[PDB]
Amino acid sequence: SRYVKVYRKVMNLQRRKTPLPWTPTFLEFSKEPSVPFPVREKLQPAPIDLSYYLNMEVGDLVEVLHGPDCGRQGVVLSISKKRNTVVVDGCNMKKSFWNPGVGASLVTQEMPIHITNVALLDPVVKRPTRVKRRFMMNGECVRISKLSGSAMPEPVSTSALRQPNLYQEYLRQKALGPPLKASYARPDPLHLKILQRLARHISWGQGSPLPTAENPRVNSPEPMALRR
Amino acid sequence: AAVNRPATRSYKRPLAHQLVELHDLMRERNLEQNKALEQAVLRFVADDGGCKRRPREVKPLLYQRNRRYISCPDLIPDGIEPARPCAEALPDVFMERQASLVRACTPEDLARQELPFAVQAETAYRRKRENFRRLQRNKRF
Amino acid sequence: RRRTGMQRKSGEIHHVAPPRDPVLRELFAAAIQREKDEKRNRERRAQEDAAAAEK
Amino acid sequence: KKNHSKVIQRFKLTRFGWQRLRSGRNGEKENLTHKQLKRTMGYTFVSRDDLWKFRFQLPSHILRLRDAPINRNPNIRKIRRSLPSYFG
Amino acid sequence: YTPPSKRTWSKQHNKIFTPRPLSERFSPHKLHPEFEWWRERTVQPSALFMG
Amino acid sequence: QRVVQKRRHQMRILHPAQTAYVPVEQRPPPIPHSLTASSTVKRLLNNNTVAAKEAAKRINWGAYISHQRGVRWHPQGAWRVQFSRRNHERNFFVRCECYFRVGTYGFQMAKDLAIRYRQRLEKEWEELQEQWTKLDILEAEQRAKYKEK
Amino acid sequence: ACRPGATRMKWYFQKPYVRRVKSDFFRFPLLSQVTKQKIDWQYHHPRSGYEAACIFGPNTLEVTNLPMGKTCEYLQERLWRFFGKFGIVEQVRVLPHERDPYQTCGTAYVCFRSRMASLRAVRLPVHLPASLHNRVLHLRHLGTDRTSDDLFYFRRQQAISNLVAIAQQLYAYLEERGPLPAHRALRLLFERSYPRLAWRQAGFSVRTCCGSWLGFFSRSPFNELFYLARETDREENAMLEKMVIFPHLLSREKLQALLLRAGRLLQMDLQNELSVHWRTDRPPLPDWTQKQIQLWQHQDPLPEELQIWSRTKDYYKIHEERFLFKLKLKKERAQAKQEMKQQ
Amino acid sequence: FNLQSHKTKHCVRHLRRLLGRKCPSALLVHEGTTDVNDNFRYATAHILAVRRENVEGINVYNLLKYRQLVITEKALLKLIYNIQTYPEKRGWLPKYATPDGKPAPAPEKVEGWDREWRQMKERERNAKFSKALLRERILKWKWSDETKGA
RNA sequence: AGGCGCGCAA
RNA sequence: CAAAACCGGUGGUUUGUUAGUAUUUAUGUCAUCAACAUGUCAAUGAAAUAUCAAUAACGAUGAAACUUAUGAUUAACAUAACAA
RNA sequence: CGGCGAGAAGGGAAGUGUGUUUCAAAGAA
RNA sequence: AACAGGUGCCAGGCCAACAAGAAUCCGAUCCGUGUAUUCCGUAC
RNA sequence: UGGGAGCGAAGAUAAUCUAAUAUGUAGCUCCGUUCAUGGAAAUCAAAAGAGCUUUCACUGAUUGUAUUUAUGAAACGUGAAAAAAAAAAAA
RNA sequence: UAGAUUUAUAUAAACGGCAAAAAAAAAAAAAAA
RNA sequence: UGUAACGGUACAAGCUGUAAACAAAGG
RNA sequence: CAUUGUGUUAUGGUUCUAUCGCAAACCAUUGAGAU
């Protein structure tokens, strides 16, 4: 069929983050105005943060309900309220990349799971449950699970949960660029300092001759001077 | 040209000691004031030989309409105000200022016209260099 | 937010922190005090002119 | 653009015009004389009356017609040699 | 028509099938209305004998 | 493919005629183009024949040449005198369309009178320009005197 | 496009399990040493690891480390082929993955006809090729607890390195002290044990790579370095007690090449004993049986007569004369070559 | 365009001094690195009558839109270089297929290279055997049916 | 990268 | 030949001043189904926290009123007043 | 002043003259 | 000139909690965010 | 879902009509869209070479199929985008 | 997140043969989705 | 999730659930 | 050149629009946090 190509083009226009940045160059003008914008329906349900109403916090034990990790149990490490997504320990191991540090050639790590695909676990029955916040007379808050009526254990602490995020380090290094030459990366502090002194003279010398063994005198820079 | 190249495996760049030695040779031949050499030194120092790296930053040309405000006092010496123009308005260029804008040409003017673009660029570079100045404060006199 | 929130006279405003170096710190303090002194000079001149006009 | 794959097969574009074979090339020819047979097996040019068809059947192959110049300036005519000057 | 490949020529019936969630394609980072997340499920007994 | 058709004749590619440059110290003035509007001259030019080419040599084309700007020949059978000027600042627009007819005066006499007419028009125009400059200076003097008060 | 058949298989990288809070059993339960999975006292039962013995009898081996991306039936056939080398295999079973019944969890059970066959089979681990993810299958006999020797390959690699070092040492000693008697020269040679490389008297690498010092000397390329000359274990000792080792005068490059060659040959010897052929000491198989064996791994090409219909009408003339004649000419050429092979 | 103060009022006063109090609008052209500084970028950010541009973004549209053009010397030289070297970049000028890219010397002609042609023209200039020469040419030469080449 | 054109004279 | 980020919080810009708007039933049909009814939530006015006084007249407020303010707006079309 | 050579499947395809070229119906993000 | 909202209609300086004019003159009948002139704020 | 899978029409062009086009389109059933499709050569090519897969432009409306109507993002190839192969014998 | 929060929307599928009544003794019993 | 039926509320195109617009001052 | 017509004006008739809204993208800042 002779329409698949144009259909794919117009559909990619729906995902394009137009306008994209464009570097000016002499006698060249951007095509961004000619690129059309994506079309969307603006009358939709308002944003919500489902974690607030579900009483789900980092450090809670949850079970993945659907997908290739069905039945797997892990501790929540991160919650995105805007995306209503959750990172679960050892689940959705989808993001693999060249190792930015020491160890094996490749490293893989979790990816967010939508909060609706996950459920809190009852401490006694260990099945999907619903957690409600109750308040005592003094104002102490207690999270109670529907299935057994048990109080939720305190979330695992950030100190225990912490792990480095190697994908962000990989992204940082990639943004920096390809690896440097070993010779270029070798430090040369003495010659660098010589060049830095020369650069100081070049930038702030106002075109005075460089010092020599014959005349090492110090040339006084001129001030801007007021108009009179 | 090369100091601006990336320091990756596929580029040819001078090393720091090579730049120092080249500067020394030009100094011995009384060419240390070379514009290209000076600019190469500056660009090399700016990046420390290309070892300190940052994402490509673009200095803004326009700002958003209702941007935030950064409040800072005038960091200027005392008793200083911008200079004031002479009179109110200059005479009309076409109606009264025609004679002042035209002058008979001379061989010196022809020579200045015939001067080359490299000489013009060096003149501009050295002029900016010499005129890079600033206003002093009381404790600097 | 002016689209969904209240009306506000002032946008987001930031005041520069002072420099750590003592010399630049002293110069910055001098500049700030100069701004304050100019404002107070305006106010005092206004008061003096008001009194003179009253008399 | 789009060209006619059938029309293209019967014609050849040259620097002097479109060329074509002659109907009767593949027909009965026992009663033709030698002159007529030579002309029949030769070639000829598409008539100017049939060129408008090409404009739409073979868009990608254009022959730019070139007739003789038509200049009515009296000074270029042979009678100008009998005049002491030009007309202007 | 797309000719099959080494990985694609074998297929199961749309309704009579062995469920294999490990290999079935899924997008866990999206909301799926078909699963009715809002709807609460009943916790059945985990062991039964004689019904 | 944009193939330019070419014509061949006697085993050569035929081209439009094209002549070279013949330097001339002083090219004489052309015979007026107004003659080509006459029926006789039009037929002479349109008939490429021996009789036409002999009549062309018998015709005295030099009598129609005017050595005066603004005077020339018209198919009327007369000498046309023209003089056009536009002065917006003084609101003065002149267009002379004078005819000196051969039937009325004579070929040569009409030519002479037309030339004299054009010369007089030029002289009057010069004098009028001088007078306008003088009047303008006077007007400036009056405006300055008024502003004195 | 549609639901996936057994041709489409997926698996994902397993994150190593870390009990971040040692006391929090609810969120970081203990692993079971038997099942190597998190303990679930609520919904699981204890397993001793001998349950399959009651199903498959005493002559049973448990196989572990089986790879992903393979059907349980394909793996069963492959394991049957491998373990047929030791005797009659009554049965082979491969446990499916909890999350994909078409793939394996990594465990299998092999039931043998004979105790001796099972015991012989358990001795060495099973090294698989790249297509099987280069996995080394670990074997465990359910009736005697005997396990495979998972370090055999790397211990033999260390032994080969030790043998090369021994050859170099002996050549250096001969170059320094000249010809030496065998019983005195052999005591100057040392090897480094596996895996921590502690110095030892060189007597184990020789017997694991060659079987004896005489074998070491008589097997190439060490007989191009050394020359034994006359002036059971008892015979070996007596025979060595009356010899002198003489060197073959070599250059550095030749000696280095010889050492590399010795390493390569010993490596080949190591690979042979792990890739022994599965048809060894077995009767020939008919052509139909061989085709059935092949079909477990490869499918024959579809008939060209059926294939011709795929030539799209948009650009092809189906059943075209020149194309069909080309097919006939190719068939004739193939038949002629086969006739030449027959004759 | 290097300024020592970020205050809009000082830059407004400088612009008024240079261009007067009746300037409709201005386009300020600079290179970006050492021709102008962040103080200038801050000061001009609220002068709605002026627009800052780099040398790369100069257009007939900008020049027509903004009444005045205020250009630094460095930016002016950069613009002049770009304008003068654009034809070479776009390939509107001839190349010489030499390692240096400059023209090579024109060789001399071999003596008598056209003597036979001159003699043939001299023979044919008699022109009295016109039909005979025409028939000779018809026999010798053939019109080509191709559209490219001879 | 590619496209069109590229004297029939000398 | 010149020049050389991730998860929360807070605002702004663009989409979008250049584009459009979509949630409730009156009415048809056996049913599938079809289909922009009735200006606006809103007297007028910027303000009713300017409609007070009052049988009537003169008054009050208001820029404009018992009214070209106590709903506005062509033509066709409806009625009158004035004119030779 | 480089020497008889470092385990390359006996199978698929390519003109039917295969002396030659290419691939291995067998594996991961 | 998009230096946004509101204030009787077109307001950078009247309100809007952080800058800056109750600025002056001229307006049929009320008002003016309007015309003209001018001062001031702005890393908004 | 002019994306992918299955089944699968007629009004319209052919100046009737058949093929072909429409079109593998509409309706119907099923996937649910870059965390996807697909995929690391028993590939393509010439006697030189390229190097999984994918996207864009050109080659080109060319070579093709249809042989009254039309269809044709062909193959090799060229210039770009993106770049990846395979952590992994146990511990 | 102080509490409370009726009824309908035919749901053992947070699940697995298909097939009426979200899942029905074997067989009769039949399928491009 | 979304929607609706009844009921309460100015007998309603709004709000709301028999606690039907409000607890924030408890051993 | 009518009181059965016309000219001019007046009164009716008459279309109904008062933002109850404004990222899922990008820019800039700022906490926690990693290096």
Q: Are G194 and G150 in contact (CB under 8 A)?
A: no
What separation in angstroms does the CA of E25 have from each of A83, B61, D68, G256? Answer: 21, 47, 74, 55
Q: How far apart are CA G214 and CA G235, in angstroms?
A: 11
- Chain D segment 11-70 residues within 8 A of H by beta carbon are 12-16, 19
Going by C-beta distance under 8 Å and a sequence separation of 6 or more, which residues neighbour residue D77? F45, F48
What length is written for chain H? Answer: 150
Q: How far apart are CA G326 and CA G322, in angstroms?
A: 6
F52 closest CA partner among F65, F61, F60, F43: F43
Map A127-148 to HEC letters: CEECEEEEECCCCCEEEEECCC
Which residue's entry shows tokens 């015939």?
B114
G8 touches chain A (CB under 8 A): no
Q: How far apart are CA B22 and CA B41, in angstroms?
A: 11
Q: How far apart are CA H56 and CA E47, in angstroms?
A: 77
Q: How far apart are CA D11 and CA H24, in angstroms?
A: 67
B90 closest CA partner among H28, H69, H22: H22
- φ, ψ dihedrals at F50, nearest 5°: -65, -40
For residue F107, the one-letter residue type is F
D54 closest CA partner among D16, D22, D11: D11
What is the CA G2 to C1' M25 distance in angstroms?
22
Q: How far apart are CA G298 and CA G292, in angstroms?
A: 10
Q: How far apart are CA C32 and CA A144, in angstroms?
A: 57
Q: How far apart are CA G89 and CA F27, in angstroms?
A: 121
DSSP designation for D87: B
A125 touches chain E (CB under 8 A): yes
For residue A107, the one-letter residue type is V
Going by C-beta distance under 8 Å and a sequence separation of 6 or more, which residues neighbour residue B14? B2, B3, B22, B40, B44
Going by C-beta distance under 8 Å and a sequence separation of 6 or more, which residues neighbour residue A161? A58, A59, A75, A77, G20
For residue G109, the one-letter residue type is Y
What is the CA H47 to C1' J8 distance in angstroms?
37
Going by C-beta distance under 8 Å and a sequence separation of 6 or more, which residues neighbour residue G53? G60, G142, G143
Q: How far apart are CA H33 and CA D79, in angstroms?
A: 75
Roughly how many angstroms between the first and final C-alpha of chain F, as a whole number?
A: 82
Report the relative pairing of strands D17-20 and D11-14 from DSSP bridges: antiparallel
Going by C-beta distance under 8 Å and a sequence separation of 6 or more, which residues neighbour residue F2? D62, D64
Backbone region of residue H32 per phi and psi (left: phi > 0; alpha: psi in -120 to 50; beta: other values) = left
Q: What are the beta bridge partners of residue F83? A: F96
G142 closest CA partner among G107, G104, G103: G107
G19, two tokens: 């009990």
Cis ω for the linkage preceding A19 (within 30 of 0): yes
Q: What are the beta bridge partners of residue D87? A: F31
Report the relative pairing of strands F92-101 and F78-87 from DSSP bridges: antiparallel
What is the dihedral sign for C-alpha B7, B10, B13, B15? Answer: positive
Q: Are A81 and A57 in contact (CB under 8 A)?
A: no
Laid out side by side, the sheet with G180-181 consists of: G180-181, G243-247, G226-230
What separation in angstroms does the CA of A2 have from each of A6, C28, H19? Answer: 8, 70, 60
Q: How far apart are CA H134 and CA H119, in angstroms?
A: 18
Q: How far apart are CA E21 and CA G232, in angstroms?
A: 63
Per-residue DSSP letters for A158-171? Answer: HHHH----HHHHHH
Interhelix angle B35-47/A189-204, rounded to 10 degrees, is 120
Going by C-beta distance under 8 Å and a sequence separation of 6 or more, which residues neighbour residue H45? B63, H8
E1 closest CA partner among G7, G309, G306, A7: G309
Q: Where are the alpha helices (DSSP H) in chain F?
A: 39-46, 50-58, 107-148
Touching subunits for chain D (3+ Cβ pairs under 8 A) = F, H
Query: Cα A129 vs. chain centroid, distance in angstroms?
Result: 31
G242, two tokens: 């009356």
Q: How far apart are CA A11 and CA A36, in angstroms?
A: 12
The answer to whether the beta carbon of residue G339 comes closer than 7 angstroms to any atom of strand K is: no
The answer to whether the beta carbon of residue C14 comes closer than 7 angstroms to any atom of strand J is: no
A190, two tokens: 């003495």
Q: How far apart are CA G183 and CA G244, in angstroms?
A: 9
What is the dihedral sign for C-alpha G61, G67, G73, G78? Answer: negative
Going by C-beta distance under 8 Å and a sequence separation of 6 or more, which residues neighbour residue G58? G115, G142, G143
G215 closest CA partner among G228, G205, G206, G225: G206
Mutate to test the interface with H, among F11, F12, F13 (most CBs of H within 10 A): F11
CB-hemisphere CA count at 13 Å for D8?
Answer: 9
Cis ω for the linkage preceding G221 (within 30 of 0): yes
What separation in angstroms does the CA of A185 have from each of A173, A179, B41? Answer: 15, 9, 18
Q: What are the beta bridge partners of residue H26? A: H50, H68
Residues 39-58 of B with CB under 7 A from strand J: 39, 43
CB-hemisphere CA count at 13 Å for A36?
Answer: 9
- φ, ψ dihedrals at A18, nearest 5°: -70, 145
Roughly how many angstroms between the first and final C-alpha of chain H, as a whole number?
A: 63
Query: Cα B50 vs. chain centroid, distance in angstroms?
Result: 22
Roughly how many angstroms between the first and final C-alpha of chain E, as a whole number?
A: 50
What separation in angstroms does the CA of G127 have from each of G65, G67, G94, G237, G270? Answer: 10, 12, 17, 37, 12
D83 closest CA partner among F56, F42, F37: F56
A200 closest CA partner among G51, D74, G212, B42: B42
Going by C-beta distance under 8 Å and a sequence separation of 6 or more, which residues neighbour residue G32? G38, G39, G47
Q: Which nucleotide is nearest to B67 (CA to C1')?
A: J12
- φ, ψ dihedrals at A192, nearest 5°: -65, -40
What length is written for chain G? Answer: 343
Q: What are the beta bridge partners of residue H53? A: H29
Determine whether the interchain pair B17/A199 forms a contact, defined as Cβ–Cβ distance below 8 Å: no
Q: What are the beta bridge partners of residue G223? A: none
Residues 1-51 of E with CB under 7 A from strand O: 33, 38-39
* 3-state SS class at A213: coil
Q: How far apart are CA A67 and CA A87, in angstroms?
A: 15
**E22 vs G contacts (CB less than 8 Å):** 10-12, 97, 99-100, 103
Q: How far apart are CA B23 and CA A205, in angstroms?
A: 17
Q: How far apart are CA G51 and CA G40, in angstroms?
A: 18
What is the dihedral sign for C-alpha G212, G214, G217, G223? Answer: negative
E22 closest CA partner among G297, G13, G136: G13
Q: How far apart are CA G119 and CA G145, in angstroms?
A: 10
Longest Cα–Cα distance of chain D, Å, equals 66
Show contacts of G22-31: CB within 8 Å, 24+ apart: G24/A153, G24/A156, G26/A61, G26/A123, G26/A153, G27/A61, G27/A75, G27/A153, G27/A156
* 3-state SS class at F43: helix
Q: What are the beta bridge partners of residue H71? A: H29
What is the dihedral sign for C-alpha G51, G54, G56, G57? Answer: positive
- φ, ψ dihedrals at G219, nearest 5°: -95, 140
Q: What are the beta bridge partners of residue F88? A: none
Per-residue buried b or exposed e for E13-48, using 16+ beta carbons within 10 Å of the residue's own CB: eeeeeeebebbbebebbeebeeeebeeeeeeeeeee
DSSP designation for E28: T
Q: How far apart are CA G2 and CA E9, in angstroms?
A: 10
Going by C-beta distance under 8 Å and a sequence separation of 6 or more, which residues neighbour residue E38? none
For residue D55, the one-letter residue type is R
Helix/strand number for chain H, H first, E second: 6, 3
F69, two tokens: 């700007």
Q: What are the beta bridge partners of residue G199? A: G192
Q: Are G153 and G179 in contact (CB under 8 A)?
A: no
Per-residue DSSP letters for B54-97? Answer: -------S---TT--EEE------TT------SSSSPPPTTTT-
What separation in angstroms does the CA of F40 have from each of A107, A158, C26, F33, F48? Answer: 103, 114, 106, 14, 14
Q: What are the beta bridge partners of residue F73? A: F79
What separation in angstroms does the CA of B108 have from each of B105, B115, B117, G262, H77? Answer: 8, 11, 17, 88, 21
Determine whether the interchain pair D13/H147 forms a contact, defined as Cβ–Cβ distance below 8 Å: yes
Going by C-beta distance under 8 Å and a sequence separation of 6 or more, which residues neighbour residue G27? A61, A75, A153, A156, G21
**G21 vs A contacts (CB less than 8 Å):** 156, 160
Helix (H) or strand (E) holding A86: strand A85-88
G250 closest CA partner among G159, G161, G167: G167
* 3-state SS class at A78: strand
Q: What are the beta bridge partners of residue H30? A: H54
Cα A43–Cα A44–Cα A48 angle in degrees, nearest 5: 140
The CB density around residue A144, as the number of other CB atoms within 10 Å, is 16
Q: How far apart are CA C48 and CA C55, in angstroms?
A: 11
Going by C-beta distance under 8 Å and a sequence separation of 6 or more, which residues neighbour residue H82? A26, H55
Q: How far apart are CA D24 and CA D39, in angstroms?
A: 10
A133, two tokens: 């916040």
